[PDB]
Design a protein around this ligand. Structure first.
Ligand SMILES: [Mg+2]
Ligand SMILES: [Mg+2]
Ligand SMILES: [Mg+2]
Ligand SMILES: [Mg+2]
Ligand SMILES: [Mg+2]
Ligand SMILES: [Mg+2]
Ligand SMILES: [Mg+2]
Ligand SMILES: [Mg+2]
Ligand SMILES: [Mg+2]
Ligand SMILES: [Mg+2]
Ligand SMILES: [Mg+2]
Ligand SMILES: [Mg+2]
Ligand SMILES: [Mg+2]
Ligand SMILES: [Mg+2]
Ligand SMILES: [Mg+2]
Ligand SMILES: [Mg+2]
Ligand SMILES: [Mg+2]
Lengths: 190, 201, 345
RNA sequence: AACCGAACGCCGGGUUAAGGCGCCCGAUGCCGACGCUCAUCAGACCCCAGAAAAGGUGUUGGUUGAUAUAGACAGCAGGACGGUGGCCAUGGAAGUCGGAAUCCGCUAAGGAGUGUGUAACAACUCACCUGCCGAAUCAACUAGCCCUGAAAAUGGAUGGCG
RNA sequence: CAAGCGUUCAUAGCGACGUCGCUUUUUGAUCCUUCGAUGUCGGCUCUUCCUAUCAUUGUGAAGCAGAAUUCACCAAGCGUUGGAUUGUUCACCCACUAAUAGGGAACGUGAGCUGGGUUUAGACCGUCGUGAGACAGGUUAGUUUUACCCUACUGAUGAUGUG
RNA sequence: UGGGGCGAAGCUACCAUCUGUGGGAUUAUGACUGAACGCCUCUAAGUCAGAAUCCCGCCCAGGCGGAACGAUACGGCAGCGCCGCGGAGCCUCGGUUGGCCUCGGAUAGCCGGUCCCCCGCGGGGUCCGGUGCGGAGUGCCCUUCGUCCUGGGAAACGGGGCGCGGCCGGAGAGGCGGCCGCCCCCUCGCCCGUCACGCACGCCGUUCGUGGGGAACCUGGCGCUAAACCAUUCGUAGACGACC
C-alpha cells in the first residue's frame, strides 16, 4: 500500500539559520557550519516557516519503506542543529585489571596514542576525523573527551579507538579491558 | 537518421543502450559511443562486480591465451555486450562491428561535436529512483583498469575547456537577442510571416 | 582418482613463456615512482658482468650469531664506465596507455652510438644522424628544437634520457654501444628538462646515479643453455632405471580427458637465454678506474683501508674469460643473472 | 525420435495453429492495463530437465481474536507488600534445586510468585498496580511475493546476449 | 521436530521415537552405448579441479581464566611428509611435523613406465570328480608392439599488415 | 678411453652461493549515525574498520594493436618527395545540404540582469526579473535549388581571385581551426518590373560528398642522394633454423 502523504516538521531555534540548496541542507549557528546531502533519500524539503521557523520534510507517493526515512532525515537535521548550537561530547573511560592504558593526544585532536594495553608492545595509533577535537580530561582519572560538531564523525572516532582497543584469543567476559564510551552528551547543555 | 552518430554514454544502461546501438549498426548507420566510463548498470555495485569476477574465472584451462578475453576498459566491456547482440560469426556481423566505435573519455573529433542521448536506454527513465548502482567506470577499475585516474584528469581538462566555448557561445546568443531588438522594424514584416505558419513563437 | 601423496608443482608459471628472449640489453619494465619534491636523478644505468670474488666484511647485525665477526660474501663486479647522454624523450599519459611525443638527440652524436643503428656498417656509408645534426645550427634550429622543448614542457609528463654506453673503453671485442632510455625521476618537468638540455653530449658516471650501499635491482638476460629435456628445464623427477622409453621425462602429461595437454605441464624447451629482473641486491663498493696524475692508480680499486696493498680488483690474468676491468665497476653482493661480458641493466 | 500444430506435386498472393515480438531474430520503435518483487545464489514457461520438511515483525494482502479517551499501546518515575522460616521438603527453598498447592488483609496492588540469582536471603527484577504522556495499539494464524535449507570436481550457461 | 544427557539447564556441547533431504569417493539394481574386441587390477611420475577445511590468515562459539579445546563463517590462499610390513587398493605400527583432511578428472594417467597381483598355454599341493577334468581352495616360471600422419602443448622459424 | 694420481677450462649440486619485492574493493565479522518501530535497534536511506580472500602492483610473455625519431637509393645504366599546377584509364565502391561542441538534475532545472559583495575581460557569491509538457525547443538552427539580360525599390562594402605573407590557439589517438597586412577582381540576400537560356516534341539509374579510394602513364621547381638480406666473421647464442 502506498501512502498518499507522510511528513514532519523540525522546530528550528532562533540561534540557527538553515538554508537548503534544493535538497542539500546547510546549517550555521554559533559553533560553526554543517552540511549534508539527502541526494538519495528523495523527499521534498520545504522551509515553510517565515522569519525562519520550520523545516518540513514531505515524502509523498511513498510506500512503507521510504515512509521510514521521513523521520530519519528529520533526525540527521535535529542532530545537526544540536551539533552546531551545543556541540557534542562523548566521554570514554579506560578500563582495567592491570596494565595501565596510557593515552596521549598528539597534534591537537587527531592522534590518540595508546601504550601498554594488556602489556602489548605495539603502540596503537588512531586518527580522528576532521573537525573532531580529542583531548585528555581532567576532574577524572582514565577518561577521554571527544568534542565535535558532527555526531557521525564524533562517534566513528569513539568507536575507532573503542575498537582499536579489543582483546584477542581470550575470554572477553573476563578480559574486560580497553577504552569505551561512558557518556554521550554535549559541550554546552542549556 | 543519416550520417555518423555520436552517443554520450553517461547516464545510460549498459545493455539497454547496446541493444539500440547494435540494431543501428546492422542497418548500416555508423555509431560512435563515447564516454563509456559514465555508462551505468542496474543491480547494486558489488552484484555486478561479483558477476564480472565470475566472468574472469571462466577461462580456457588447457591454454588461457586462447580462452575468453575479459577486456577491462569500459569501452571494451560495452563493445563486448554490443557484439553479443550481433551475429558476429558472419560477415555482416563483423562488417557491423566495424561501423561501431567506442571510447573511454571523449576524444578529438568527438569533443568537438554535439551529441546525442538514447532516452530509452537512459537510466533516469528506465530505472526506479530507489534502486542501486554501479558505474562501469568503477566496476572497470576494481576489475583491472589502469586508467580511471587519467581519464578523470583529462576529462576535467576537457570540461574546463568546453566550458569556455559554452560561455563564448552563450555570449553570441546574447548578442543575437540584443541585435533582434536593435533591428526590429526592418525585419518586422518578415518575422510576421515566420510566426504566421508557426515558426518562431 | 586423486594424487595419493601430495606435492608442490615443479617450477612457477608466473614466469612461463620460457622462450629465448627477444631482446638482450635487459629492458627495464617499470621506472620507480617520481615524487616531485626531491632533486633530479637518473634511475638506471647499464654496466656489464665481469667475474666474481671473496670479500671480507665485519658485520653489524646486533642479535645474530655473527654480530662482529668476519664473514666472506661472494660478490660480482660489474664494469660500469660512464654513460654518455645523447638524446631526451618525452612521454605523455593517455587512456590508451603512455604514447611518446618527441625524441631529440644532440648536434654531434658519437660513433659507437652510430653502431646501434645500421646492422652491417662497413658496407654502409655511415649516414645516420647527418641531417638531424644539421639542425643544431640555423633558423630552423630554434623551430624544431626550442618550440619543441617548449612543447615537451607544456603537454608532457615523463621524461627519459637516451644514453649510449662507451664500448671503446672496454676489453670487449664489441664496438656497438648500448642505448637506453633512462627515466629522470626528478622534481617537476622543466626542472626535469632544463638539465637534460644541459647534459646533452655529456659524461655521466656511476656516482651520480648510485650511492655505495643502495639496494638496487639487476635486470639482464639469463645465461644460455639450449634445448633441455624436462628434467633439466623444468627440473622434474627422473623415472627409474627400468623404464623402456626414457627416464628423463614426465610419465603422465594429462588425464585422457581434458583432451589437450595443458598449459602447465612439464615440457622440453629452450632453457636459459630468458629475460629476468632480479631485485634488491646490495652495492658493496663503487669503484674508480685506474687513472693518471703521474703514473697510474691501480691501487684505487681493491685496496681497502684495512689491508692497504695496491691491488686492482683485476686478479692475476684478468677476470677469466673477458679481461681487465679498467674503469668504474660496481661490486654487487652475490651473483647476478647472465654470463660474463653481458650487458647488465 | 516420441511433446504442440500441423502431414508435406511445384509456385504468387492472402490468412492462420502451436508459438512468438529490446537485439542475435522476423514482430510492440503500443506515450498498452492492473498488480507483485530487488535476490551478498534473482527470476524468468506443458516434457522439461530441479529441491523439502522446514524456516524466514525480507515486504504485500487476508483471517480471526484482542485492546482503548472511565483516556490503553509503547516510552521515562513509584511501589511490587503484609498475614508469613506459609506448607512440603532441611540440603537448602522464609515467593523462589523440585511438588500439594493454594487464600485473606493492606487492598490500589502486588502471584504465598516470573525470573536473576542466592546454600538460604538479600539486593535486584518481573506479574499486579501506579506517576508522567497523548490515539490508535496488539497477538496468533493464513497466504502472496524474496531472503535461508542449498555442498562437487577440463571454464560457464533463463538459448545467448542481456 | 523434538523425549533425554549435560550437577542445575533441551538445544555450550550433545541428543532418543520420528521425519525431510542432498551426494555421488561405497556397494546394488538396470542393461542405454561398445563384442570388424575402447588394453582388465595395483604402483611409480605429473598436471589440474572440487570441497566433503587436516593445518595456516581473519573471524564469530563454548560448560573459554590462563593454558589447553572442541561448535560454527568467509575461506580453498599456500600445506598434507619419511618409513616397517603388505601384489594390493584397503589396513596397522614407528617416526617426524603443522597436517600428517577427503575427493574427482574413462573407477585421471600400458604407443608414460613397471608388471607385484588378477587372468592363457608349463607346473605343484588341498578338496571334489569314477575321469577328462573342476575349484575368489593354496603355490613357482611365464614375449607387454607401432608415432612419420591431424591435433594440444613446448620451444623455433616465420606471416599479411606499417612505403 | 690399456690402467690409475693429480687436474685448467666448461657444465653442475639445501652438496657451494645469491635474490624473492606493494596497493585497492570489500566476506565473515565487528562497528557509527538512524529510521520502520513517539524506545530499541550494523540498516529500512546513509557511514566506518576488515583477510593466507578477490582484483590489481611489482614479475614474465608480448596483437592481423599502437609510438617516437634516423636514412631514404649518383650512377657505370637509376628512381623518386614535395609543391604546384598540367593531359589519357584499368578498377573499387558506399553515398546523393550541413549543424562548429557546456555541466549535469531529475521530488528539479534554464536563462537574464546585477544595484551590491568577493576572486582571477572573465570566475564565485547574494538580490531581483523572465522562461520552464521546455520557443537563444535536436518536435530543434542554418543555407539554399533551373542560368543570366536590364532597370526600379528594399538592402550596400559584402564576396571572391586553391588571391597572396605574418602572429596565434588547439595535442588523449591535434589535425584543424583561429586571428592580422597587400595586390587585382567582382556588387551578389528580399520585393518587383523585364526580358531571356535546345520548348528534345507524359518515361529509367535525374542532382552531390568527387579534383573520391586505389592501380597504371604525358609537363615545370626544388631537393634527394640506401639500406636490408646472402657470403664472411664472431660468439653473448645452437638442431637446424633463430641471436650478439
Ligand atoms: Mg585460550
Ligand atoms: Mg590433496
Ligand atoms: Mg623394461
Ligand atoms: Mg535434566
Ligand atoms: Mg585399438
Ligand atoms: Mg564450506
Ligand atoms: Mg617404500
Ligand atoms: Mg583407471
Ligand atoms: Mg604398453
Ligand atoms: Mg594411455
Ligand atoms: Mg605376474
Ligand atoms: Mg598356468
Ligand atoms: Mg598329498
Ligand atoms: Mg579322488
Ligand atoms: Mg583495505
Ligand atoms: Mg556488514
Ligand atoms: Mg572501508
Amino acid at each position: 500500500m502506498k501512502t498518499i502523504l507522510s511528513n514532519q516538521t523540525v522546530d528550528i531555534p532562533e540561534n540557527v539559520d538553515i538554508t537548503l540548496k534544493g535538497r542539500t541542507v546547510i546549517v550555521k549557528g554559533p559553533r560553526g557550519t554543517l552540511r549534508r546531502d539527502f541526494n538519495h533519500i528523495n523527499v521534498e524539503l520545504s522551509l515553510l516557516g517565515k522569519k525562519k521557523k520550520r523545516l518540513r520534510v514531505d515524502k509523498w507517493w511513498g510506500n512503507r519503506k521510504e515512509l521510514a526515512t521521513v523521520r530519519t532525515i528529520c533526525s540527521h537535521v535535529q542532530n545537526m542543529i544540536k551539533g552546531v548550537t551545543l556541540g557534542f561530547r562523548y566521554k570514554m573511560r579506560s578500563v582495567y585489571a592491570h596494565f595501565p592504558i596510557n593515552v596521549v593526544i598528539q597534534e591537537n585532536g587527531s592522534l590518540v596514542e595508546i601504550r601498554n594495553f594488556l602489556g602489548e608492545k605495539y603502540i596503537r595509533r588512531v586518527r580522528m576525523r576532521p573537525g573532531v577535537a580529542c583531548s585528555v580530561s581532567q576532574a577524572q582519572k582514565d577518561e577521554l573527551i571527544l568534542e565535535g560538531n558532527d555526531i557521525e564523525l564524533v562517534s566513528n572516532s569513539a568507536a575507532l579507538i573503542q575498537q582499536a582497543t579489543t582483546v584477542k584469543n581470550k575470554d572477553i567476559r573476563k578480559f574486560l579491558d580497553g577504552i569505551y564510551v561512558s557518556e554521550k552528551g554535549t559541550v554546552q547543555q542549556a | 537518421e543519416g550520417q555518423v552518430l555520436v552517443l554520450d554514454g553517461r547516464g545510460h544502461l549498459l545493455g539497454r543502450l547496446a541493444a539500440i546501438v547494435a540494431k543501428q549498426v546492422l542497418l548500416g548507420r555508423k555509431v560512435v559511443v563515447v564516454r563509456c566510463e559514465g555508462i551505468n548498470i542496474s543491480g547494486n555495485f558489488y552484484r555486478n562486480k561479483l558477476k564480472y569476477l565470475a566472468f574472469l574465472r571462466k577461462r580456457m584451462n588447457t591454454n588461457p591465451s586462447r580462452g575468453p578475453y575479459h577486456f577491462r576498459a569500459p569501452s571494451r566491456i560495452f563493445w563486448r555486450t554490443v557484439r553479443g547482440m550481433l551475429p558476429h560469426k558472419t560477415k555482416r556481423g563483423q562488417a557491423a562491428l566495424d561501423r561501431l566505435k567506442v571510447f573511454d573519455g571523449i576524444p578529438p573529433p568527438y569533443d568537438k561535436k554535439k551529441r546525442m542521448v538514447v532516452p530509452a536506454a537512459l537510466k533516469v527513465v528506465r530505472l526506479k529512483p530507489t534502486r542501486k548502482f554501479a558505474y562501469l567506470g568503477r566496476l572497470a577499475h576494481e576489475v583491472g583498469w589502469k586508467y580511471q585516474a587519467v581519464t578523470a584528469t583529462l576529462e576535467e581538462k576537457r570540461k574546463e575547456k568546453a566550458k569556455i566555448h559554452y560561455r563564448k557561445k552563450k555570449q553570441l546568443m546574447r548578442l543575437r537577442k540584443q541585435a533582434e531588438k536593435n533591428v526590429e522594424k526592418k525585419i518586422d514584416r518578415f518575422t510576421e510571416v515566420l510566426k504566421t505558419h508557426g515558426f518562431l513563437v | 582418482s586423486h594424487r595419493k601423496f601430495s606435492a608442490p608443482r615443479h617450477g612457477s608459471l608466473g614466469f612461463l613463456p620460457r622462450k629465448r628472449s627477444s631482446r638482450h640489453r635487459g629492458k627495464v619494465k617499470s621506472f620507480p615512482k617520481d615524487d616531485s619534491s626531491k632533486p633530479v636523478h637518473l634511475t638506471a644505468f647499464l654496466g656489464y658482468k665481469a667475474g666474481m670474488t671473496h670479500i671480507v666484511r665485519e658485520v653489524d647485525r646486533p642479535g645474530s650469531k655473527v654480530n662482529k665477526k668476519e664473514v666472506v660474501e661472494a660478490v660480482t663486479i660489474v664494469e660500469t664506465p660512464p654513460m654518455i647522454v645523447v638524446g631526451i624523450v618525452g612521454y605523455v599519459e593517455t587512456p590508451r596507455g603512455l604514447r611518446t611525443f618527441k625524441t631529440i638527440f644532440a648536434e654531434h652524436i658519437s660513433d659507437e652510438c652510430k653502431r646501434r643503428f645500421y646492422k652491417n656498417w662497413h658496407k654502409s656509408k655511415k649516414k645516420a644522424f647527418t641531417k638531424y645534426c644539421k639542425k643544431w645550427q640555423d633558423a630552423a634550429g630554434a623551430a624544431a628544437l626550442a618550440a619543441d622543448f617548449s612543447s615537451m614542457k607544456a603537454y608532457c609528463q615523463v621524461i627519459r634520457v637516451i644514453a649510449h654506453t662507451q664500448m671503446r673503453l672496454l676489453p670487449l671485442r664489441q664496438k656497438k654501444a648500448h642505448l637506453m632510455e633512462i627515466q629522470v625521476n626528478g622534481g617537476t618537468v622543466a626542472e626535469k628538462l632544463d638539465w637534460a638540455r644541459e647534459r646533452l653530449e655529456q659524461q655521466v658516471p656511476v656516482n651520480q646515479v648510485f650511492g655505495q650501499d643502495e639496494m638496487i635491482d639487476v635486470i639482464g638476460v639469463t645465461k644460455g643453455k639450449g634445448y633441455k629435456g624436462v628434467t633439466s628445464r623444468w627440473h622434474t623427477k627422473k623415472l627409474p632405471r627400468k623404464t623402456h622409453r626414457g627416464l628423463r621425462k614426465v610419465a603422465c602429461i594429462g588425464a585422457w580427458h581434458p583432451a589437450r595437454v595443458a598449459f602447465s605441464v612439464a615440457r622440453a624447451g629452450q632453457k636459459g637465454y630468458h629475460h629476468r629482473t632480479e631485485i634488491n641486491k646490495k652495492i658493496y663498493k663503487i669503484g674508480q678506474g685506474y687513472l693518471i696524475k703521474d703514473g697510474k692508480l691501480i691501487k684505487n680499486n681493491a685496496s681497502t683501508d684495512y689491508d692497504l696493498s695496491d691491488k686492482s680488483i683485476n686478479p692475476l690474468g684478468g677476470f677469466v674469460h673477458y679481461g681487465e676491468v679498467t674503469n668504474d665497476f660496481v661490486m654487487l653482493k652475490g651473483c647476478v643473472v647472465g654470463t660474463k661480458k653481458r650487458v647488465l641493466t
